Design a protein around this nucleic acid. Structure first.
Ligand code: A1IC4
Ligand code: K
Ligand code: K
Ligand code: K
Ligand code: K
Ligand code: K
Ligand code: K
Ligand code: MG
Ligand code: MG
Ligand code: MG
Ligand code: MG
Ligand code: MG
Ligand code: MG
Ligand code: MG
Ligand code: MG
Ligand code: MG
Ligand code: MG
Ligand code: MG
Ligand code: MG
Lengths: 64, 52, 100, 117, 102, 88
RNA sequence: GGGGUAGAAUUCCAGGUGUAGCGGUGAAAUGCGUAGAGAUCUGGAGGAAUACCGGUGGCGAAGGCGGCCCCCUGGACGAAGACUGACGCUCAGGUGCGAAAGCGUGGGGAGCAAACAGGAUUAGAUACCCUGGUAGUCCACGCCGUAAACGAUGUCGACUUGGAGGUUGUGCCGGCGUGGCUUCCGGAGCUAACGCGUUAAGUCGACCGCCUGGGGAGUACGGCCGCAAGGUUAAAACUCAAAUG
């Protein structure tokens, strides 16, 4: 997230662009997941439950 | 897909230099795999960047 | 069996590149060398620094050769202190058409 | 002393603490100030306000160098990411750019075990 | 980094805390030995040991059986501790014996 | 695997024709060729257990084909194993 | 399977700049720092792992397998044919493979971390929390042979309404088919029920493994295997009138 303040821009507008650049790039989410060690079984289990949730919401979006 | 075709590859990397998901770009799975190989080969040769 | 060799030379040693490109092709064409493509890309800007260098002299070669002579060529690139990086690839077919 | 036209504000924003350090463009330290050294102690350090104060004291340390331009280099997930730079701009430096320089391993080393709390 | 390197040696002055072990009248031998080994560990390391004995319900009738347990710990830790204060009456529903390191 | 030329040699040698790829002689000759070829591979690569499973399948398929040829025609069997240099 | 190599990051070392904190928690303290830390910048060293891509995506008999490149190598699948001519299915014993921990010998050791040391917490705290930290985690070779090694579902073959997806071939003219693998739902049927449902737990056939109340016990004894840790095979007395889904 590299944000050069462009020719004549306010700070508050420029700060919104910087925070959004970080939000999209995925830096705070990335640091937090790398804070503590997650063993592969936990990783895989987490990934399965997300996949179940995502898919089950589509079947709740359907049938309605 | 070609590792030398920097123009096309640059459409499927972010500003930081990270490969974009196929759900976003709408790429087919087979080509997404070729794309990822190409980008990593381009990264090795310093045609594309890893980071920053 | 259809290779694709990129190698990047130290940008100060762009004058050596003439002599080296001869040696490599001469060795390949020694043993049924089929130089399908040869493109001096020139001194390009690197996307990141390699050995405190922000430029290097790129070269491309698509060749068909023995699988021994390419391994013997790979041995030379290691010894060549000028040449900084190289990727030898395997292609399924010959590539004659031009790259950007 | 020397005058410096343009500086760099390195903001080491950890979860527990904020370190603000103004350097030259070549990363030579001019002055530094922390939330822990700003009369905040313990978990008082880990607020946006304590970072804001640390920024101000850092600005006050590098008044003598006569800096008007700073490039920001924020690092970490700390609560005082945005509060530092806001307070740096309030000191009256023109913030030319903002960069995120948070180290991400491309895999890297195995992290410590999860806290069971 | 100056005054701390003096105050470290001032901090080394050991701070004797009181360690509370609570007995009952019913406490069995095996469990008494655990609690005794706990008390030994404290008094070995130069820590004071508050020794409560809690009564429940109609155990307040038979107080002397509680006193036997408190008497026994004193006897077992006779040469490893001195009795700073021995209880007399049941304050609340407890009798507290504070021991001290020798 | 064997090369297309290596295959085409064996089919001509051990077959009744170049079209005859099916015959037990060809099959056993092909299996033998590859089994013998892979002995060098597994000499160097001792820990390649995943590939070795493929080798054991070749040996098991050869055995079964030879046993079939024995009870079908001993003359063809006896000729084949002496040509290829198989013990049994 | 083998070899090479790239970038990021942690740690450490050497310097420069700089100055009083750093680190940590629920709150602290231990710890680190004026012999100059933390921070920041330049360079170097070393080990381990490969962000994004990444997907109820793929591959593999199972265990498992994730940077990129080459070398060696196993399997699967599709299209048309051509060929062999029942050569098949299953498999007690046997043989091999088999996560992690562990064991032997020799290397290696960044990060992490059983044990352990100190700091806390507490009624106690042989813990959870904090600061350190050894084996180990890594490599070679040999050993061990077990896991909720799970789909808690043996292998092979045939048959029996549907719907919506994913992945990977292929023919024909985005459309219309047709193969392989795979996810979710659901019909008959089945099931104690939950559920399963063409990838069956349906309807059948072949062969193997296994069960016969709970605890005692996967224990004892004996055999076999192991350097050891232990593994494997595997009871009974006795006691209960339950245990269980
Ligand atoms: N010591 C004793 O014999 O009894 C006292 C015990 O019951 C205290 C109680 N402890 C807990 O729950 C544990 N949860 C696991 C992490 C450690 C610890 O925290 C507790 O209430 N803690 C507080 C912090 C504390 C410790 N001593 C006095 N206060 C606490 O914040 N607990 C949190 C919770 O209950 O959700 C949580 O466990 C937590 C966050 N951070 C920490 Cl440390 N613990
Ligand atoms: K070189
Ligand atoms: K048999
Ligand atoms: K260690
Ligand atoms: K029911
Ligand atoms: K035994
Ligand atoms: K019984
Ligand atoms: Mg597989
Ligand atoms: Mg598994
Ligand atoms: Mg079978
Ligand atoms: Mg292991
Ligand atoms: Mg060892
Ligand atoms: Mg540690
Ligand atoms: Mg710990
Ligand atoms: Mg078992
Ligand atoms: Mg089972
Ligand atoms: Mg169903
Ligand atoms: Mg049933
Ligand atoms: Mg046993």
């Amino acid at each position: 997230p590299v944000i050069k303040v462009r020719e004549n821009e306010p700070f508050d507008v420029a700060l919104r662009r910087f925070k959004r650049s970080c939000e999209k790039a995925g830096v705070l989410a990335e640091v937090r997941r790398r804070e503590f060690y997650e063993k592969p079984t936990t990783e895989r289990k987490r990934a399965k439950a997300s996949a179940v949730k995502r898919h089950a919401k589509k079947l709740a979006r359907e049938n309605a | 897909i070609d590792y030398k075709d920097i123009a096309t590859l640059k459409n499927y990397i972010t500003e930081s230099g990270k490969i974009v998901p196929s759900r976003i770009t709408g790429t087919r799975a087979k080509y997404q795999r070729q794309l990822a190989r190409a980008i990593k080969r381009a990264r090795y040769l310093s045609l594309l960047p890893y980071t920053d | 069996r259809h290779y694709e060799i990129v190698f990047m030379v130290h940008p100060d040693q762009s004058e050596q590149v003439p002599g080296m490109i001869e040696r490599y092709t001469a060795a390949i064409t020694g043993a049924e060398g089929k130089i399908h493509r040869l493109e001096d890309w020139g001194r390009r800007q690197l996307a990141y620094p390699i050995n405190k260098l922000h430029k290097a002299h790129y070269v491309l070669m698509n060749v068909e050769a023995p699988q021994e002579v390419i391994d013997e060529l790979e041995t030379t690139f290691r010894f060549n202190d000028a040449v900084i990086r190289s990727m030898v690839m395997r292609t399924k077919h010959a590539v004659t058409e031009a790259s950007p | 002393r020397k005058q410096v036209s343009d500086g760099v504000a390195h903001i080491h924003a950890s979860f527990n603490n904020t370190i603000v350090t103004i350097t030259d463009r070549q990363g030579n330290a001019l002055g530094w100030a922390t939330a822990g050294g700003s009369g905040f102690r313990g978990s008082r350090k880990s607020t946006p306000f304590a970072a804001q104060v640390a920024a101000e004291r850092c600005a006050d340390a590098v008044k003598e160098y006569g800096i008007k331009n700073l490039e920001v280099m924020v690092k970490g997930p700390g609560p005082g990411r945005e509060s530092t730079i806001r307070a740096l701009n309030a000191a009256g430096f023109r913030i030319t750019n903002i960069t995120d320089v948070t180290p991400i391993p491309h895999x890297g080393c195995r992290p410590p075990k999860k806290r069971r709390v | 980094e100056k005054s701390k390197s003096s105050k470290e040696q001032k901090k080394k002055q050991k701070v004797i805390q009181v360690k509370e072990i609570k007995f009952r009248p019913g406490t069995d031998e095996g469990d008494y030995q655990v609690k005794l080994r706990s008390l030994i560990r404290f008094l070995e390391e130069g820590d004071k040991a508050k020794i409560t004995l809690r009564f429940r319900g109609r155990e307040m009738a038979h107080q002397q059986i509680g006193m036997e347990v408190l008497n026994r710990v004193k006897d077992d830790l006779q040469e490893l501790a001195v009795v700073e204060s021995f209880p007399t009456k049941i304050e609340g529903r407890q009798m507290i014996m504070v021991l001290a390191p020798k | 695997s064997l090369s297309t030329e290596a295959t085409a040699k064996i089919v001509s040698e051990f077959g009744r024709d170049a079209n005859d790829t099916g015959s037990t002689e060809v099959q056993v000759a092909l299996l033998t060729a590859q089994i013998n070829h892979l002995q060098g591979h597994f000499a160097e690569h001792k820990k390649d257990h995943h590939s070795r499973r493929g080798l054991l399948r070749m040996v098991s398929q050869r055995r079964k084909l030879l046993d079939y040829l024995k009870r079908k025609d001993v003359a063809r069997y006896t000729q084949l194993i002496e040509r290829l240099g198989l013990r049994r």
